[PDB]
C-alpha cells in the first residue's frame, strides 16, 4: 500500500518481542480533555488518544473505504423492507470491569446525545430520522420509540427503526445511527448534568477496547494496560503511554527517541522529520478536500434556500472555467508542499475508492491557452494599453478573499493573482490582505452572504460518509457561493436515492456528480492531502491502513 511516495505500513524485518511498552504522543499546543463518552467529548486530541481504549467504544469494523464489515465488537445489518438497522453485540463483548455490554448500553448512547440534560453538542438533524427520537430530544416522550430490544435490555440485539433508509447507512460516520456504547450500569446514578465532569467518564471510565486506562493525568496523558476482558486478540504489549507533546517540542522528542510514534504532526515539520535517522515516516491519504468558491448569489435563511442572483462575470461558465484552468496548483504543491498536498481532480478525496475515480478530470493541470481561448470566445477581449480583458466596456476585475492558514499562504495567493494576470484577469486581495480564519468563517457563513468578494478558498475534513448535501445543496448554508443548479440538485439526490443502495449505482452517481460539478465550475477542486506519521524503527506491525482493525492488539516492539 502506498500513499503518494509514502508507504502506508512499516514492514519491520525484526520479530516482535513478548511484552514491551509503546510510547505514543499526539501533537497539540492545547491540553487534552479526557471524556470517554463519545457523545459528550468535543476534543479531537483526546478522541484520537482514546484509540487504544476502543476509540470511545466504537462498535463496528470497516474496510479501508469505511464501509461496515462484520467482526468488530458488534455487527450492523440493514433491512430495506422494514426500514431497520439491527445491531448485534458480540456474546463476549464486555466492559473493562468484566460486566456485560448489553443492548441498554447502546441505547444509552442515544440518551447522552439526545437528552439535553447531559449537555451534548452532538445532536444532528440526521437523528430526527429515527422514529420517536425527535420527541425524546424535545422532552415530549420519556423513551425512544424507534429503538427496541428483541431480547430485552440485557440482551445483545438492538433494532433501530427509521422513517427513511439512506444509502450512506453502510458507511461509518453516516450519522443516521450511532456507533458507540456507554456503560449504563456504571453511570446510571450520576445526574445527567454531572456526567461529563464525573470521575467515571474522565479519570476512571469503563471501556471496551484492547487496553484500558489505568491512569489519566488531566490535560496530559494516559497510561494504558491490557484489558483482561477484551473479546479479541490479547495485545502483544504490556503497556502504552499516550501523551500530548507541543509543536515546539515534537522534533526534539523524535531526536531523543522520547516517543515511538507521534500523531498529528503538521505539514510544515515534515522536512525536519524526513531526515531523522531511526524513524520510518509513513503516509496516508487524508479525508480532506480544499476548493475554490465563486460568489454567485445569496442565502435566504427564512426559506432555507440559496438563490443564485449575484451580478458578476462569474455567472458565465466560460469565466469560471478559465479562472480554474489559469491556476498552477501542481506547481504550487511541488514548490511548497513536500508531497503532502497533491492536486485534486474532483471534490471527493481518492481514499473513497468506492465513490470516485482518477478518471474524472478537473483543473489539476494548468492550461493557460485554454483559459485565454475561453475568455476570448465569450467576448472578454484583451487590451493593448492595460493587460486586462473588457466586455461591453467593463474590465474583468475580481476580489479574492484569500486567507491565513497555510505556512506560505501569502506566497500562494500572490502566485494565483499572477497566473490570473496572464489570462487578463485583474485580481486583488480582499481589503488588500489575507483574511483571518475567524473573520473568514463569519464572512462566509453569516446570511445572506456578502457581495464584496468574488473568489475564496475553503477546506474541509470530511466524515467517512462523504455527504455532499451539507456542503453544496440548494438548501445548504455552507454553499458559500450560493449556486442553485437543477442538474446538480438531481445529481445530489441520486447519490442519496434508494437506487444508490447498490454500491455500483452509487459510485456512478458520485462520479456523474463530480463530472458535472467540474464542468459547471461553481466551485473548483484544489487539493487533496496526505497525513504523515513518524514511527521508530523498533515498532512492529504499525500501519496507517484505514482497513487495519486490530493495530493496537498487533503492534509490538522488536526490542
Amino acid at each position: 500500500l502506498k500513499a503518494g511516495n509514502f508507504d502506508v505500513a512499516y514492514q519491520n524485518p525484526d520479530k516482535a518481542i513478548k511484552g514491551g511498552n509503546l510510547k505514543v504522543a499526539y501533537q497539540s499546543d492545547s491540553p487534552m480533555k479526557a471524556q470517554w463518552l463519545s457523545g459528550l467529548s468535543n476534543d479531537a486530541t483526546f478522541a484520537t488518544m482514546s484509540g487504544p481504549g476502543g476509540g470511545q467504544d466504537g462498535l463496528f469494523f470497516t474496510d479501508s473505504g469505511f464501509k461496515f464489515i462484520k467482526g468488530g465488537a458488534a455487527d450492523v445489518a440493514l433491512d430495506k423492507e422494514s426500514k431497520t438497522a439491527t445491531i448485534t453485540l458480540r456474546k463476549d463483548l464486555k466492559w473493562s470491569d468484566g460486566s456485560e455490554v448489553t443492548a441498554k448500553d447502546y441505547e444509552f448512547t442515544y440518551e447522552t446525545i439526545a437528552n439535553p440534560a447531559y449537555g451534548s453538542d452532538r445532536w444532528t438533524d440526521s437523528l430526527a430520522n429515527i422514529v420517536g427520537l425527535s420527541d425524546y430530544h424535545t422532552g415530549k416522550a420519556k423513551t425512544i420509540s424507534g429503538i427496541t430490544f428483541p431480547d430485552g435490555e440485557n440482551g445483545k440485539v438492538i433494532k433501530v427503526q427509521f422513517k427513511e433508509m439512506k444509502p450512506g447507512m453502510t458507511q461509518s460516520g453516516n450519522g443516521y445511527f450511532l456507533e458507540t456504547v456507554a456503560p449504563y450500569q456504571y453511570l446510571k446514578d450520576v445526574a445527567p448534568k454531572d456526567l461529563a465532569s464525573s470521575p467515571k467518564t474522565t479519570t476512571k471510565p469503563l471501556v471496551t477496547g484492547p487496553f484500558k486506562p489505568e491512569n489519566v493525568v488531566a490535560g496530559e496523558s494516559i497510561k494504558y494496560v491490557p484489558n483482561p476482558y477484551y473479546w479479541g486478540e490479547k495485545p502483544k504489549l504490556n503497556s502504552i503511554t499516550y501523551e500530548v507533546v507541543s509543536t515546539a517540542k515534537s522534533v526534539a522528542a523524535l531526536s531523543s527517541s522520547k516517543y515511538d510514534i507521534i500523531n498529528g504532526m503538521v505539514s510544515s515539520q515534515y522536512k525536519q522529520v524526513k531526515n531523522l535517522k531511526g524513524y520510518k515516516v509513513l503516509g496516508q491519504q487524508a479525508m480532506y478536500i480544499s476548493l475554490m468558491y465563486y460568489n454567485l448569489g445569496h442565502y435566504d435563511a427564512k426559506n432555507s434556500i440559496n438563490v443564485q442572483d449575484r451580478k458578476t462575470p462569474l455567472q458565465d461558465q466560460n469565466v469560471r472555467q478559465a479562472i480554474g484552468y489559469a491556476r498552477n496548483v501542481a506547481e504550487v504543491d511541488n514548490k511548497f508542499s513536500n508531497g503532502l498536498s497533491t492536486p485534486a481532480n474532483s471534490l471527493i478525496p481518492p481514499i473513497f475508492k468506492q465513490f470516485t475515480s482518477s478518471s474524472v478530470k478537473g483543473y489539476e493541470k494548468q492550461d493557460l491557452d485554454k483559459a485565454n481561448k475561453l475568455l476570448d470566445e465569450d467576448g472578454w477581449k484583451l487590451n493593448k494599453s492595460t493587460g486586462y480583458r473588457e466586455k461591453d466596456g467593463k474590465e474583468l476585475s475580481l476580489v479574492y478573499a484569500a486567507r491565513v492558514g497555510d505556512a506560505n499562504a501569502e506566497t500562494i495567493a500572490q502566485n494565483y493573482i499572477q497566473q490570473w494576470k496572464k489570462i487578463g484577469v485583474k485580481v486583488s486581495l480582499y481589503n488588500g490582505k489575507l483574511m483571518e480564519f475567524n473573520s473568514w468563517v463569519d464572512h462566509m457563513t453569516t446570511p445572506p452572504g456578502a457581495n464584496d468578494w468574488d473568489i475564496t478558498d475553503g477546506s474541509w475534513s470530511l466524515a467517512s460518509e462523504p455527504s455532499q448535501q451539507d456542503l453544496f445543496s440548494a438548501a445548504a448554508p455552507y454553499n458559500f457561493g450560493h449556486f442553485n443548479d437543477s442538474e446538480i440538485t438531481k445529481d445530489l439526490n441520486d447519490i442519496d436515492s434508494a437506487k444508490s443502495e447498490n454500491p455500483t449505482y452509487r459510485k456512478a452517481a458520485f462520479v456523474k456528480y463530480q463530472e458535472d460539478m467540474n464542468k459547471k465550475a461553481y466551485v473548483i477542486p484544489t487539493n487533496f492531502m496526505l497525513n504523515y506519521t513518524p514511527v521508530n524503527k523498533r515498532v512492529v506491525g504499525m500501519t496507517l491502513d484505514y482497513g487495519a482493525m486490530n493495530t493496537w492488539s498487533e503492534i509490538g516492539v522488536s526490542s
Partner: peptide, 6 residues
Amino acid sequence: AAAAAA
C-alpha cells in the same frame, strides 16, 4: 454536522 472546517 458530519464535515468540519479544516
